[PDB]
Amino acid sequence: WMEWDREINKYTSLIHSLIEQSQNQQEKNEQELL
Amino acid sequence: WMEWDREINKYTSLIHSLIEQSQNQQEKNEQELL
């Protein structure tokens, strides 16, 4: 359970970073359509 | 747990709708490519 808690935290952090990165790229791509 | 149940229902419905929308868009995209 201690290892589980650590791994949940690490992956939660990574996914958040990836979603933020994806949101920023999505906005850039939509602007570039013009 | 009452809120948890409510939110599970909300997001499940939303994902189902998004999957349907994406399936529809994939079909349109393939048609356009052809």
Added chain:
Amino acid sequence: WMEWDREINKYTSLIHSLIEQSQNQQEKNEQELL
């Protein structure tokens, strides 16, 4: 629970196959940019 276990295994094998396919397609697509 025996059915639950079976279903988890079946969808896990499916998503692993899809992720592998996506990884290969991603590699090809990136090389095609050149």
Added chain:
Amino acid sequence: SDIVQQQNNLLRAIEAQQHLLQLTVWGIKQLQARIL
């Protein structure tokens, strides 16, 4: 063509992921009754 194919790949992965998420929700609900 190859971009469109990859969108289909990712869509299918998301679909499979959704089945797994629904399974985990089922398991939690089954345990919740007993453990509370």
Added chain:
Amino acid sequence: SDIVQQQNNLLRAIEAQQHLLQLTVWGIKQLQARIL
């Protein structure tokens, strides 16, 4: 345009699935606290 639209769709799906994942993590943590 339609490829970018499809990426918007899949990102939205991923975001909604992340909300579901966070919910399942919360649920497991509550059950773990009790059955320990």
Added chain:
Amino acid sequence: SDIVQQQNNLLRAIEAQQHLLQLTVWGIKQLQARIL
């Protein structure tokens, strides 16, 4: 290029989410074993 970059972003998100999913499966199995 920027569309393919977004496909990399989304695939990585799906993969990380799958890791998290597998962690939740482990957690459910542990709790189930303790109760049933």
